[PDB]
Design a protein around this ligand. Structure first.
Ligand code: NI
Ligand code: NI
Lengths: 379, 361
């Protein structure tokens, strides 16, 4: 009801890092960012014991965590629980992402998202539909049964539900360009991924409307001498964002800093996280298979990487600590960049007046201490 | 003589940042940098207790520190005093720098350097003469073996003046200069490769006349020295300069007596400048010199310029090493390089140094 100021902290506003300043938050909104010694006399205050204050992290790829997987329990309540799981690692907003499955599976996630975001804003900001219209040669874990080409019907559906769908990942090389443009028209972000595309194919795709790559280096045509492939295409195109899993397992760290020099503010940190993340587990079911959690990594019984358990705060940390990217910039790859990429950046991603109070607080050891969501404080 | 190892630390070798590795030192040289599990069974190790380890910093502009000023006491001991002052801020090599008035003075500087450098290697890398004609350059060239660097204003000197020096082996830096863009650009062709405190004392970049900083920005092989104390140049300017200048941005102190020394005032060639809240001023309160330390420089660029620690470190070590061409021996931690290392913690406090393989505190 009354305002409160966060206080005693290094503030990463996204344009500046400020010492001896504070943020007054008013309801669900930030009111000012100003020098500590300007706060009104008996303004309520929260001492952050000198920790770091950034906007809450935005994950654009998250299959589930907190011990759940959106694909099994495709319900509004699964979303809810992942949301709270996120919060324990400073992630305040995300795309409940649903991997390649039945048309009917698709129809209910549409509902699940619709139900949730009627109830709560700025948390799940739309679905990420990853598949099914992919390429079998770059299938990953995505069942050889539900991968298909794009039919007119189910795109028509996706478009009619654009108001709850944020992003689709698809493999352009053999689906209608119509379908890409249609989704873009509909205000949906179309991402290339899981694709055996040629450089020139991806380029066409971009030109039809694709503006995002999902998990760069994962299930894509690698860049080779005579064939730039998809990673080539992405490097060569200024307007396309690329998500990247920085967990030391999916892509090699060197590849991430090379990627960051090329792509700068178009590189986005992504978890592609799975059940284990934010939880404690022995194993789980990634549509079908048993994925053991073995001290940080996901692994099918051979020890072959199974999936991701990355947390958003870990992603930032690793970027700073292994990739060599400065903290402020790494923060941005977890916040401003994804916001921009899904066009929510007018209200999230930045600590500035008028914007939504979705902040995160963490210590120098990359421990998330607390979380403010829509103005709500929580530890 | 036995090899030992430094162990338990983040190692900033300058190419990689390594964890759960050690660096083994043999003689005055690095022998290896390898994972902890490879150290011979019975090899004494220094447990740095998870602190950071880098090459020792190399500061190519330094007038004074530890209470002294090279200008007043133009002796080999003054050089020794400041070297010793430096080790407290992580600085294991420097260019003792002199603002020339007389040639008597300048000849002493030559003596003091020759004398010092005879007794120690890899600490003073040579004179840096800044300021203040034919016969002066001859003397400098004649003594190139102890002179690492000259700062001068090319609008004021025969281009052949720069060529001789360059030919001699010296490094010529543009500084204290009223040069036009096209003048600087010409000096660079004559052989200038460095620039002395970027932004300070030099023709600014305007819309219709890029000036010196403009020239510097436009010439990729010019190094720019920069003072990152947040007094001499605004932190945003440094951010900008780093993005333009990359690896050619060198972190410099240009420091004076009060740097690393409890002190009230001093004469800086002329006026008496005071030391109030870690800053040099008049009783007026204007900027009167630098009191900056290498480690504070690295810290400042990390913390207020937004540059990643490893790059910041490189600006303090490999870039200055390259700029004066000693990077075959100093400026990186790798097999065969000379073992000058600095250790420091999370909060940018120096804890030890190793100079030529000798450890400290
Ligand atoms: Ni995938
Ligand atoms: Ni000067």
């Amino acid at each position: 009801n009354a305002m409160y100021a966060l206080t005693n902290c290094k503030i990463y506003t996204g344009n500046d890092v400020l010492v001896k300043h504070a943020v007054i938050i008013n309801g669900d909104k930030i009111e000012a960012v100003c020098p500590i010694e300007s706060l009104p006399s008996e303004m309520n205050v929260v001492d952050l014991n000198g920790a770091n204050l950034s906007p809450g992290f935005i994950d654009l790829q998250l299959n589930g965590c907190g011990g759940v997987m959106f694909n099994d329990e495709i319900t509004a309540e699964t979303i809810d629980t992942m949301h709270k799981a996120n919060l324990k690692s400073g992630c305040t907003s995300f795309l409940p992402t649903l991997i390649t499955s039945s048309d009917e599976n698709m129809r209910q996630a549409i509902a699940a998202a619709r139900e949730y975001q009627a109830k709560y804003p700025n948390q799940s900001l739309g679905l990420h539909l990853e598949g099914p219209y992919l390429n079998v040669m770059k299938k990953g874990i995505h069942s050889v049964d539900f991968i298909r080409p794009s039919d007119d019907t189910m795109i028509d559906t996706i478009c009619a539900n654009s108001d709850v769908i944020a992003k689709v990942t698809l493999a352009p090389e053999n689906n209608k360009p119509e379908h890409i443009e249609k989704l873009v028209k509909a205000g949906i972000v179309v991402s290339i991924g899981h694709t055996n595309a040629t450089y020139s194919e991806a380029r066409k795709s971009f030109e039809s409307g694709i503006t995002f790559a999902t998990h760069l280096f994962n299930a894509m045509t690698p860049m080779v001498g005579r064939e730039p492939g998809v990673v080539g295409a992405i490097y060569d195109t200024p307007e396309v964002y690329a998500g990247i899993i920085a967990d030391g397992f999916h892509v090699d760290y060197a590849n991430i800093r090379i990627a960051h020099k090329i792509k700068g503010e178009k590189l986005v940190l992504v978890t592609d996280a799975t059940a284990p993340a934010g939880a404690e587990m022995d194993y789980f079911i990634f549509v079908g298979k048993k994925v053991y959690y073995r001290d940080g990594k996901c692994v099918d019984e051979n020890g072959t990487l199974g999936g991701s358990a990355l947390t958003m705060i870990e992603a930032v940390q690793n970027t700073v600590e292994h990739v060599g990217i400065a903290l402020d910039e790494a923060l941005r790859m977890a916040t401003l960049y994804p916001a921009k990429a899904i066009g929510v950046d007018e209200k999230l991603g930045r600590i500035k007046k008028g914007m939504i109070a979705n902040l995160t607080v963490f210590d120098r050891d990359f421990n998330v201490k607390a979380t403010v969501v829509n103005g709500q404080y929580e530890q």
